[PDB]
From Swiss-Prot, chains A, B:
Keywords: Acetylation, ATP-binding, Chromosome, DNA damage, DNA repair, DNA-directed DNA polymerase, Helicase, Hydrolase, Multifunctional enzyme, Nucleotide-binding, Nucleotidyltransferase, Nucleus, Phosphoprotein, Transferase
Described purpose of this protein according to its UniProt entry: Low-fidelity DNA polymerase with a helicase activity that promotes microhomology-mediated end-joining (MMEJ), an alternative non-homologous end-joining (NHEJ) machinery required to repair double-strand breaks in DNA during mitosis. MMEJ is an error-prone repair pathway that produces deletions of sequences from the strand being repaired and promotes genomic rearrangements, such as telomere fusions, some of them leading to cellular transformation. MMEJ is required during mitosis to repair persistent double-strand breaks that originate in S-phase.
Phylogenetic placement of the source organism: Eukaryota, Metazoa, Chordata, Craniata, Vertebrata
GO molecular function, a single term: identical protein binding
Protein's UniProt name: DNA polymerase theta
Stretch list, region Helicase activity: 1-388
One of the record's GO cellular component terms: site of DNA damage
Residue span relative to the full protein: 108 to 887 of 2590
Source domain of life: Eukaryota
Domain Helicase ATP-binding: 1-169
Species assigned in the record: Homo sapiens
Domain Helicase C-terminal: 182-388
Tissues where this protein is expressed: Highly expressed in testis.
PTM notes: Phosphorylated by PLK1; promoting interaction with TOPBP1 and recruitment to DNA damage sites.
Amino acid sequence: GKNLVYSAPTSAGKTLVAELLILKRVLEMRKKALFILPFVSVAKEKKYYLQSLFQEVGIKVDGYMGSTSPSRHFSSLDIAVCTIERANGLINRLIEENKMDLLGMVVVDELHMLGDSHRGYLLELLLTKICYITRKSASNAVQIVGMSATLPNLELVASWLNAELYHTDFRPVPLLESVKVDHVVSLCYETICDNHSVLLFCPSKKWCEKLADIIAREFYNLHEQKELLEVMDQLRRLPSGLDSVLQKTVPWGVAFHHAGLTFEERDIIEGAFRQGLIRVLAATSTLSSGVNLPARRVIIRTPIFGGRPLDILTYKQMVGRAGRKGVDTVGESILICKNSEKSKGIALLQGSLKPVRSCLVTGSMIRAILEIIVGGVASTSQDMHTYAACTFLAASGAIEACVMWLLENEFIQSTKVYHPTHLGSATLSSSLSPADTLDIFADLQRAMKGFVLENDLHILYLVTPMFEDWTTIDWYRFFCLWEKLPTSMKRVAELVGVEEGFLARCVKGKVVARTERQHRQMAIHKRFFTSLVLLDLISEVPLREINQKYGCNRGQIQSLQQSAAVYAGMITVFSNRLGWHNMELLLSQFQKRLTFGIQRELCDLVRVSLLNAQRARVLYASGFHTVADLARANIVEVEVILKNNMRTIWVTGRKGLTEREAAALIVEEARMIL
Amino acid sequence: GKNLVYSAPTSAGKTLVAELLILKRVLEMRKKALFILPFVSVAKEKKYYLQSLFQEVGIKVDGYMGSTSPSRHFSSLDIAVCTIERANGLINRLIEENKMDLLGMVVVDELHMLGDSHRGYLLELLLTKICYITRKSASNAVQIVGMSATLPNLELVASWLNAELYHTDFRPVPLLESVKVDHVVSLCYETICDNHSVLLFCPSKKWCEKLADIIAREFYNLHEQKELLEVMDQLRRLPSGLDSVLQKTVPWGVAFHHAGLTFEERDIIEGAFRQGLIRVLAATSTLSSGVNLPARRVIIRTPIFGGRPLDILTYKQMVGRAGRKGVDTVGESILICKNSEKSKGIALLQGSLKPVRSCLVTGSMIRAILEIIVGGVASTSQDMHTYAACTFLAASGAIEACVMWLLENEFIQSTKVYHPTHLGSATLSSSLSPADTLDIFADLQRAMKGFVLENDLHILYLVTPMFEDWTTIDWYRFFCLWEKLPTSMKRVAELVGVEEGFLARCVKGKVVARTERQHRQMAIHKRFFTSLVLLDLISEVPLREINQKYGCNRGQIQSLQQSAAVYAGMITVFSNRLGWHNMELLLSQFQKRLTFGIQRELCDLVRVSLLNAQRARVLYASGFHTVADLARANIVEVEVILKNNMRTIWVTGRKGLTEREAAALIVEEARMIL
Ligand SMILES: COc1cnc(C(F)F)cc1-c1cc(C#CC2(O)CCOCC2)ccc1C(=O)Nc1nnc(C#CC2CC2)s1
Ligand SMILES: COc1cnc(C(F)F)cc1-c1cc(C#CC2(O)CCOCC2)ccc1C(=O)Nc1nnc(C#CC2CC2)s1
């Protein structure tokens, strides 16, 4: 239990040691074990893998990722496969409840994210809290395991965590990088004829789509069917339907994969590629850091990604997907280059990834100081400097500035001992950034004075996150929708701050320059557009109808859905801790409605993990209005309902599931819930 | 199963035949059975009696009375002991759900209330619906039983109900009357010497307390202790404490009973009297129609009750309490008179009660027409006249006026067939009078545009009933409280319509004359005062603090509490049916908080019938925050918690309950709830 930090190339079973360590620790010490993954998709995949691997040893695995949380108390859990942000929140709650001793280990995957990133600083704060608590209160307290690619300063990380060091460059399928600069058709024919898959990485979504289209066209001109038809049918019966370009590309063993698709379409395509049904997959940079999707040959369109040379870490994790362990002998990663791009390509071929920074006046430092002070682990400046010493920044005088910032804004109170007042405790529990918590407090307080209960829009405006630009707003369509809005929605629009003058300015004149800090008035109108999108979402309108009405594709709609669900949960916890009972009561429902995009009636019916928003409606419209009512039903009835040996329905982390046993599992899990 | 209507003097076991019939029908047909009582106190007493009687025969008895409702679905019930209005609502819901065939019989007690009364018309419409649905679809489907005093037109009632007729004047303790030679002291001395109790009836509250005072003083000057001390201690530990006058009146076997007291104090006094602990009880007119409280000698202070001769029905039910069946030989009811009051006294001594009216443009007819049309039992004018014929008024052309009234106000839609739109269905389900439902709709709709969620005052203003004058508002104190009000409450005050000008007018100038219909603005300020009282009630402040702060006594506070609880439940059902999900969500909690006068935290902890608002807090402050937590606890722990072989705590329908075994039932019923 002396911690550990090791690195190794992916596609070499590098997580096996971690799984072994969690198994041994959980079985011996009978203590919990977090498993921090960077992204929600890989987190879900790991959660399902661990569930399958440990279901036979009486180990409960259920993670805190995305907008979801385990249906059972954390006490019952044995392994929690959470994400970075939600793992930080979990550790904050454990510290708050003075039950940190339940934790036995914190396994962190993809530790290289500690460096430059908007979520790495959360990992740094999490690990710093682990180290500080472990050292202040002691051999076998809390083990930390790390993972990453080749890290230039991996030994620095091990020293910071006071852990071992193991670095090895060994992969069963030795990769053969080769840059080369007619013959394209011959190359495609000879690559496909070898009975191996190909993974292309293109910079643009549109260019990925078009390149997949031309490859499918060339395969058609130069020209298993049953399994490909099965995949096509699976794609057909989805809420977003089937994409026409994807329709004409899929049945030729060619497809595309980008953030524009929906999570279900991406999952279907990834599964088809994994089984070999899809031979060529044109993905984007997002898939590079996504699920484990090995390919015999990887190809990179151009090092220019988004008007800039491709990142070295991104390129490394792209080439890491070249080679199948068990069935393939060697792997190839081609990077086509041009006369002008030859220098950039040669630069990318050589050189390892850059060293890991710390990303620590800065909001990260304000957050860390708030976490320690509110958690009751560093109340005096004498020891807070010790926490600073524990940070990765130290191991590689802003505290006084940050502590004043918290006293200036009434996050903490001085007495020289420091304490939180109400917003310090409510800000930490909600896992909201202290910078945005002031605006959230001001907006929620203003809402409770004049709330509009006519519709769901005023509640949506308060749970709409504007921390990132999910889509480029088409202001002409927004103005048309505005002039077509009801009076009930226009009341909330005027209440929040939306003005027809600004909309008119944007409709014809160019987007107003937000050169001044007082011009958060632009954020209000973007937030109202987003809240209208969310209202259409939770009103259970189809994704395509939203896309036509608003211009946001289905992938962006789903991303906004997840962001709004997480933000609604966070705001609900904030209101609960602040003692706003009516606001919390109104916001409590919206987290699940936004997670699934359903109506109030289906909220109870979606507690069954095996029930989409569309599958909840067809069962609800039939007459099953409750999970208990589901438990009392024959399998044949639900099967005929779903209809109105072929694997046609898709569910996350599925198996050889068709509509026959899908009905069987719906009732079986309904019984389990009761 | 041919219905029945019988009459007999009270104290003659008139309910024995009804109990026999309900037992027979429930055991044979295995169908439900309603037991309609006029008042909540007598309804509770009858519910407990039926529970004790039929627990051993596997018959579940649970009543819909007051602000309470059974914790189990009506399907599981075997007998429902409901009140007139809640039985009417129950039958309306059964008609709406097309399950009136579930009933087996409807036993009605105190049928004479059908005449002049504000609640008899509900009984009339209830029985009219029963007999109409019986005749339309077959006459042995739902047996009806009746009870009353000597009705001059009992045969007419039986003919209306097409039922049998039995009228007997039999009482084992015959009542005597003879004038024989302030001549009250010797009367009291000789009545108390022979070891008998006395029940005095007085026309007011203050004079009742004063007469109790003088009687106790005389007994003290002219002179079981353990049981009286037990009663005194029971009165001691109550939320309202012990009355400064009752404290010195009780030890001498003398007490008083009026609406000013709390329900618990009235229950304690009644129980003490029934056991013989209290030898003299000065009650008021309310006790006349209350629980069964026999007394050897009844006395009536004066026929003038509230500036008018005592009612004949009221006098008959007063003298009905003269004579104990089983221990007494004869009973007497003295009516002291004066030279001027001799004529009124002799007039009231002779003569039976007046004939029963029907109390049917009138709001009762609008309600009946709405009930039949919305229930789907009379949708065409051809049959609605059949319903009119089925009424008691017919058996002893306004429909067209009422039907237009409902169409004018959009309660129903004509097509010639009639249907409800949304307010017709929402008005019937909520059991709200259609006359007040328009104001309720207008007020709720206005609230959902500018709701104030800072506090509970805006929710309270919408669940505050102003159907009766519960107290005389002291406007100087109200203006002072207004001056000291926070800004958050003043915001809702201005939103609802409260004005400083009107309060200033009332503070100094005489009460403004509401001679015009547009002066419902006076009702707004009374409603706001009542809503402030309710806010302090649900904030869990003591009754005495509210009385000092507002001037309303504890009895009036409790009456307003029950009225507001019932109205909150009704408004919640109204909002649910109208599709106002946020309003319903906000109003859902408040019914229980008003029923018990507790905070949000104790709502789950009061699900145990053996937990007051003070006992919920005492257990809650200790650490029991849930019924499940209460179940998992040793009896001795809860016993010591309550303490911080003597019966000192009081619960409704109690037995020889001591604190030692009181904690035993708290955990026992806590387990039963789970
Ligand atoms: C209160 O916080 C949440 C509530 N609810 C949800 C859920 F409903 F979605 C998610 C969160 C959450 C969101 C982010 C975030 C984030 C962004 O990156 C994206 C969205 O916008 C802001 C930035 C980070 C952390 C949390 C969080 O606290 N998680 C936890 N839940 N239980 C816990 C426990 C426990 C006891 C065992 C000890 S810890
Ligand atoms: C929806 O109506 C209520 C809701 N909730 C409460 C409770 F919470 F208090 C009480 C009522 C209620 C109040 C009055 C009244 C009255 C006033 O005299 C006093 C207050 O102000 C207006 C006049 C009259 C009737 C009802 C009522 O419908 N009862 C029922 N409940 N379940 C039922 C069923 C069923 C299925 C088996 C078939 S039927």
